[PDB]
Every structure is written in structure tokens, then in C-alpha cells.
């Protein structure tokens, strides 16, 4: 959920106070005052849409930063920055291959933790082996100790 909380960070927080007032409104129909699954149904009919107990509960999961089983206010910010289809360039076989050429610096086919640390250190931004290794895992669903390209897709899926 660090993408939605980064949007929170990268965007202004007065929109977040706006969503706080909207969440105060989201006590209406809320036997909890919050946005739970049922409360997401009623908040969305208060918001205009209506997701499903799976869609409401999954947005909950999709806003479960803490795993609070609800859409909390912070989770409601996540929601408002979460209910569309925008993450672009769909980097896949073609584009993530263009990338994997450098992700897998090796010109071989595996972003090992060294390939990943090198690519990150090349990003210019601050790099941690927490970063490098969490991203290894996001890769290493096959768990090669080294991000394969399928691991690379389980890692950078849609991410741009």
C-alpha cells in the first residue's frame, strides 16, 4: 500500500483532510463510522459506485495497509487513489525484456541480488539491501536467489 501512501505523500494532504470530512460523512449508514465491507457498499452508494462484498472486501484487502479488515480513513485515501486502471507501459516480455537486459545486467537472464543492487544503485535514488532483497523476493517467487525474468514479471508486474 506504499504506492497509495506515496500518492498520499506525493500529492497534497489537504485532499486527505477533505477525505477526512468525507469519512465523517461516512459515519452516515456506518454502524461503525468507518468503511467496512458493508460500510464500503454504503459509502460507495454515498460515493457513487457500489463494489461487491468481494470487491468491497477486496478493496479492504487492497486498502489493508494494517490489514484492518476495513477501509479506514487512511485506507479510504488508498481507496480514492486505488479505484482505477492507470499504471502504464504494461512492461512485459517486450518492455521488461528491454529492462531485464539491465535488470539482468548479466546479459543472461537472472537479476541476482547483485544485478538488482547494481540497477538500484544506478537508479540514483537511495538504495537499501532491504530494497534490493524485498524486490528480489517480489522477483523470487520462483525463489532462485536471483530474479528470473518470470520472477522479474512477478516483481515489476505493471509497475513503471
Amino acid at each position: 500500500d506504499d504506492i497509495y501512501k506515496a500518492a498520499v505523500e506525493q500529492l497534497t494532504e489537504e485532499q486527505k483532510n477533505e477525505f477526512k470530512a468525507a469519512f465523517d460523512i461516512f459515519v452516515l449508514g456506518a454502524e461503525d463510522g468507518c468503511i467496512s465491507t458493508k460500510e464500503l457498499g454504503k459509502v460507495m452508494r454515498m460515493l457513487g459506485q457500489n463494489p461487491t462484498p468481494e470487491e468491497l472486501q477486496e478493496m479492504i484487502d487492497e486498502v489493508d495497509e494494517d490489514g484492518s479488515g476495513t477501509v479506514d480513513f487512511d485506507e479510504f485515501l488508498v481507496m480514492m487513489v486505488r479505484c482505477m486502471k492507470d499504471d502504464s507501459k504494461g512492461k512485459s516480455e517486450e518492455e521488461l525484456s528491454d529492462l531485464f537486459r539491465m535488470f539482468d545486467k548479466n546479459a543472461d537472464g537472472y537479476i541476482d541480488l547483485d544485478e538488482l543492487k547494481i540497477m538500484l544503485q544506478a537508479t540514483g535514488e537511495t538504495i537499501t539491501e532491504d530494497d534490493i532483497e524485498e524486490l528480489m523476493k517480489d522477483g523470487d517467487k520462483n525463489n532462485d536467489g536471483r530474479i528470473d525474468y518470470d520472477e522479474f514479471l512477478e516483481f515489476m508486474k505493471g509497475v513503471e
Binding site: 477533505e18 468525507a22 457513487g48 480514492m80
Partner: peptide, 12 residues
């Protein structure tokens, strides 16, 4: 959001 909030059309 716009047509709903009318004069206060703010969120989206």
C-alpha cells in the same frame, strides 16, 4: 463527484 456536489464539485 462534480454533478453530485453541484456548486461544491470538488473531489474528482
Amino acid at each position: 463527484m462534480q454533478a453530485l456536489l453541484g456548486a461544491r464539485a470538488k473531489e474528482s
